[PDB]
Each structure stands twice: as structure tokens, then as C-alpha cells.
Design a protein around this ligand. Sequence first.
Ligand SMILES: CC(=O)N[C@@H](Cc1cc(I)c(O)c(I)c1)C(=O)N[C@@H](C(=O)O)[C@@H](C)O
Ligand SMILES: CC(=O)N[C@@H](Cc1cc(I)c(O)c(I)c1)C(=O)N[C@@H](C(=O)O)[C@@H](C)O
Ligand SMILES: CC(=O)N[C@@H](Cc1cc(I)c(O)c(I)c1)C(=O)N[C@@H](C(=O)O)[C@@H](C)O
Ligand SMILES: [Cu+2]
Ligand SMILES: [Cu+2]
Ligand code: NI
Length: 312
Amino acid sequence: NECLGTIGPVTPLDASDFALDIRMPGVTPKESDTYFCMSMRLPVDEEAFVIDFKPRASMDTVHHMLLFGCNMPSSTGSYWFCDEGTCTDKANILYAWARNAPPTRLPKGVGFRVGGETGSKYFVLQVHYGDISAFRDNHKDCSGVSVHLTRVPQPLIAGMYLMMSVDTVIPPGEKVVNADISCQYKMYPMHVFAYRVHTHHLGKVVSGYRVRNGQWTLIGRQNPQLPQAFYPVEHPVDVTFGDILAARCVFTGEGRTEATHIGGTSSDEMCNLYIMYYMEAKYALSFMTCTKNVAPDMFRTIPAEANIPIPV
Ligand SMILES: CC(=O)N[C@@H](Cc1cc(I)c(O)c(I)c1)C(=O)N[C@@H](C(=O)O)[C@@H](C)O
Ligand SMILES: CC(=O)N[C@@H](Cc1cc(I)c(O)c(I)c1)C(=O)N[C@@H](C(=O)O)[C@@H](C)O
Ligand SMILES: CC(=O)N[C@@H](Cc1cc(I)c(O)c(I)c1)C(=O)N[C@@H](C(=O)O)[C@@H](C)O
Ligand SMILES: [Cu+2]
Ligand SMILES: [Cu+2]
Ligand code: NI
């Protein structure tokens, strides 16, 4: 149901706006925890701005959905298993829908820039099917997300700052292993408005901070075992030239018989903190990444909550 009909995926809205429905082409999981991927090229070649997102998920099977922007989807197929990949180039996450933690809307006047000469030419949708019981009907699922695109330039441009670990090693049975990430910020000011954390089963807590003149200001702190949606920041926080962004993921090796390193399988781990921000249009860049730990010693002053499990 809700599947793609004779009217197609593009809904005209007015002279310069249209909604684009990005849905699975009627797929059927045959195993629980199946991750399906699919892509949609933007229908317009010129620059546009994504200013809203509306989920169209099947509450009875969809565990989570992510929408990315990129220039080279990993497969040319109708849909594929995301284990093959999302995009050959580096995908930019735009939206996350997590079952049981409703998404928050973008601030008005803020939009992601896409298309054109340097923006994403494709949207890639990942849909995680958990309970494949509802598929006893062997029916087809068309879950997805609708995006509102406009040609009208937005005064604030949303972007993503991804902090991630690449060298972490978690010895088996090890009670506590910290993965620390830190970089100095050297662009125009960005204001953080939402954040998402991601780790696999060994993750206990993930926190990120802006450090200025030695003082730590919390950006976000979350239990990665909770739904991995983008959560709004408690208080708006600017990150400016000179500041240091610092994040820590706390892992345990308990329950594993061998060491766990960074990787894409359930037996591997990941330490990600996605910081969603907006910047004035004339100063904006759409994405930044930190995969290092430039000021290792700085963590001796990280707030205690960074090591404290979040109470349910
Ligand atoms: C890519 C293109 O040609 N677009 C149309 C106008 C348009 C752009 C976007 I992005 C959009 O979301 C919507 I709705 C409409 C266009 O440019 N049409 C012509 C026109 O405005 O007459 C050319 C000459 O500008
Ligand atoms: C090695 C690793 O940590 N990969 C993460 C972070 C990542 C996200 C994006 I967007 C990206 O372009 C790249 I290169 C890496 C990772 O795969 N995280 C998952 C996640 O955050 O759920 C995927 C599904 O986005
Ligand atoms: C009723 C509604 O959803 N109005 C949205 C436009 C929209 C339609 C669809 I169908 C959709 O899938 C998405 I995502 C967005 C809305 O707020 N549109 C703006 C517009 O009409 O330009 C405001 C200003 O009215
Ligand atoms: Cu999920
Ligand atoms: Cu992962
Ligand atoms: Ni400010």
C-alpha cells in the first residue's frame, strides 16, 4: 500500500517548489534485520534546497530509515542490500527516521543545498527492516521519505560535521575502552542544532563537546543503544575558528571472545557523532569530517558525564 502509482514521485507545489517521494520499489525482506538501499537522481540539474522531510514508514516492520545525498550510488540496480554499500563516493547523511523517537523539523530558513555543480546529484535511501513477520503476506513494501525541494535560496545552509574513529581496538572482556576524537575547527562559525550517535552493540555512551579556552561545552550526549535519530541540541551552540571539537565513545569488550576493531559488521564497532549545523549562506560549507585525535591530552579534563552511562 501507499506504493508508487500512476502519478509518479514528483508533486508540483508552486512555481519553484515540488515534493519528491523516495520509496522502496515494493520489496520483500526474507530475513529479519535486512537493510535495503535504493537511489533517486534529482529530477532537476540546477541547484535546489531541501527544506523539509516527511517519513512514510511501515510502523509494523521498519526499524529505521536514513536518507543520504551523494554523487555515485553503489549500485545501478532497482534496489540492493546495503552491505554492498551506499555510495562509491562519500555519502552525506541528510535525515534519519528512527522507530520510537520522532524526528525534529529543520528550523525555518534552513536548507541543505543539493544538485547544481557541486551538490549531491542523487538521494540514496536506506531502510532497515526489523520484524519481517508482517511479510507473511509476502507483500511488497514501499516505505520511504518525501522531501520538499525549492529553487529559492535559503538564508541558512545546513551541513554535517562527522566525528568518527578509525583505529579503535577493544580487547575482549575489557571493562572500559574510550575512543577519543578531536580536531581544531577552522571555518566560519557553525551553529549546531541536532546530533545523532552511532555505534554497534558494545557502545555505552557517546558525547561530543566544543572546547574553548579550555572550557568544555556539551553539544550532545546519548546512549547509542537508544533509537539513533537526530536529537535536537539542548541549547544552541556555535563552533568558531580556533575551537576544538572533541568526542568520546565509551565501549566495553565484555561478552566478546576476541578483540573488536572498527568495521561494518555486527562483530565490529563504529564510533560516530554526527553534528548537524547551519551556517550563513555566504560562509557555508556542507560537510566536514574529523577522523583524528589532535589533542589527546586534552581529554584529562573531559566532563565526568562523558564516562557516565545514561540512566534509562
Ligand atoms: C532546472 C530548471 O530549468 N528549472 C526551471 C524552474 C524550476 C527550478 C527548480 I530547482 C524548481 O524546484 C522548480 I518547482 C522550478 C527553470 O529554470 N525554468 C526556466 C524559467 O524559469 O523560465 C529557466 C529559464 O530558468
Ligand atoms: C567506518 C565508520 O565509522 N562508518 C560510519 C560513518 C560514516 C558515515 C558516512 I554519511 C560516511 O559518508 C562515511 I565514509 C562514514 C557509518 O557507516 N555509519 C553508519 C551510520 O551512521 O548508521 C552509516 C549507515 O551511515
Ligand atoms: C500540506 C503540506 O505537506 N505542505 C507542505 C508541502 C509538502 C507537500 C508534500 I505532498 C510533501 O510530501 C512535502 I515533504 C511537503 C508545505 O509546507 N509546503 C510549503 C509550500 O507550499 O511551499 C508551505 C509554505 O505551504
Ligand atoms: Cu534500524
Ligand atoms: Cu555502523
Ligand atoms: Ni550564536
